Design a protein around this ligand. Structure first.
Ligand SMILES: Oc1cccc(CN(CCN2CCCC2)c2nc3ccc(-c4ccncc4)cc3s2)c1
Lengths: 18, 309
């Protein structure tokens, strides 16, 4: 699922600007 | 309204307020958040008993990472703007080591926390916040301010359950085109990535990313590293969850439009195309501005050169 794929990406936390 | 708002804005912007408090007038309580040049602290104005959010920035560290301009510019915008969905800056001052920004404390915490907890917001819950961002961007864009950092992490929820935008670290007063590579990967418009000279329409794309994330629980483009996210954004290939209404999908197809000649908010009708869209039909635009609509959620923080300032 897309939800599981989102978790698989370690990008579920607070994101910093580039 | 916008003309009077521009007139009010310009006076303050052309003659900014400096040194309106001192560090000894506040009792530092707890760290609320952390950034590149310092922290944000829960603070108490000792001679009134009122609480505030104190942003502390290390001058040496600001100079170190070459962010002087963006730092001076944030305080300058914060002290000159006035809108219900933008945090009020109460005081600003500096000492030997630091720059201080004292704002109204927003106890409700970041939309981010609530969104990761609940999983996703219903479409009525997502729309209530969307509407606030539409009016906020219309206010900022009319002042020639490009926001460039929309994300749930920069949107705080107040006691009335309304949004408060706190971070103006990448905002820029520009009438036409600008080039800086800045923002957050998931929210970067294709034109920023593809290194074009971009405009205000990037904020309308970021609105599509936000509306999508609020309604699904995840952004429209994610991957392990920024570079892979950039590829998905430039392709414009977007998959929508089956629970998204037909109206939501259509607004998003128009907001997350790679061709800014077709992007909603960038057409001749401007913001009115977003405001008049089907998904926003039940939205009482004036009531939202007036904070007369009842919030669907009423609330929250984790544990942890400069002459013109
Ligand atoms: O150079 C620095 C130094 C310190 C902080 C920052 C930016 N960040 C941190 C980074 N962002 C958040 C997560 C991802 C991206 C913040 N700015 C604010 C501003 C105001 C409030 C606040 C207002 C009212 N009531 C409560 C809290 C909280 C925060 S957290 C940059």
């Amino acid at each position: 699922t897309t939800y599981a794929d989102f978790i698989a990406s370690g990008r579920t936390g607070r994101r910093n600007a580039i | 309204f916008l003309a009077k708002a521009k007139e009010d804005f310009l006076k303050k912007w052309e003659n900014p307020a400096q040194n309106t408090a001192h560090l000894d007038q506040f009792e530092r309580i707890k760290t609320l958040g952390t950034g590149s040049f310092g922290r944000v602290m829960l603070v108490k104005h000792m001679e009134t008993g009122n609480h505030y959010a104190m942003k502390i920035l290390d001058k040496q560290k600001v100079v170190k990472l070459k962010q002087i301009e963006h730092t001076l510019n944030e305080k300058r915008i914060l002290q000159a703007v006035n809108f219900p969905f933008l945090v009020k800056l109460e005081f600003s001052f500096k000492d030997n080591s630091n720059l201080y920004m004292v704002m109204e404390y927003v106890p409700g915490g970041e939309m981010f926390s609530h969104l990761r907890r609940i999983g996703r917001f219903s479409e009525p819950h997502a729309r209530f916040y969307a509407a606030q961002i539409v009016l906020t961007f219309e206010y900022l864009h009319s002042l020639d301010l490009i926001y460039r950092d929309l994300k749930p992490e920069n949107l705080l929820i107040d006691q009335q359950g309304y949004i408060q935008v706190t971070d103006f670290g990448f905002a820029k007063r520009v009438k036409g085109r600008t080039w800086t590579l800045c923002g957050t990967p998931e929210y970067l418009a294709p034109e920023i990535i593809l290194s074009k000279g971009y405009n205000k329409a990037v904020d309308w794309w970021a609105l599509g990313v936000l509306i999508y994330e609020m309604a699904a629980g995840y952004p429209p483009f994610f991957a392990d590293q920024p570079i892979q996210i950039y590829e998905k954004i430039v392709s414009g290939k977007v998959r929508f969850p089956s629970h998204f209404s037909s109206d939501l999908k259509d607004l998003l197809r128009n907001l997350l439009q790679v061709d800014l000649t077709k992007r909603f908010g960038n057409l001749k009708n401007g913001v009115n195309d977003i405001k008049n869209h089907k998904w926003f039909a039940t939205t009482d635009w004036i009531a939202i501005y007036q904070r007369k609509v009842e919030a669907p959620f009423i609330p929250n923080f984790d544990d942890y050169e400069f002459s013109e300032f």
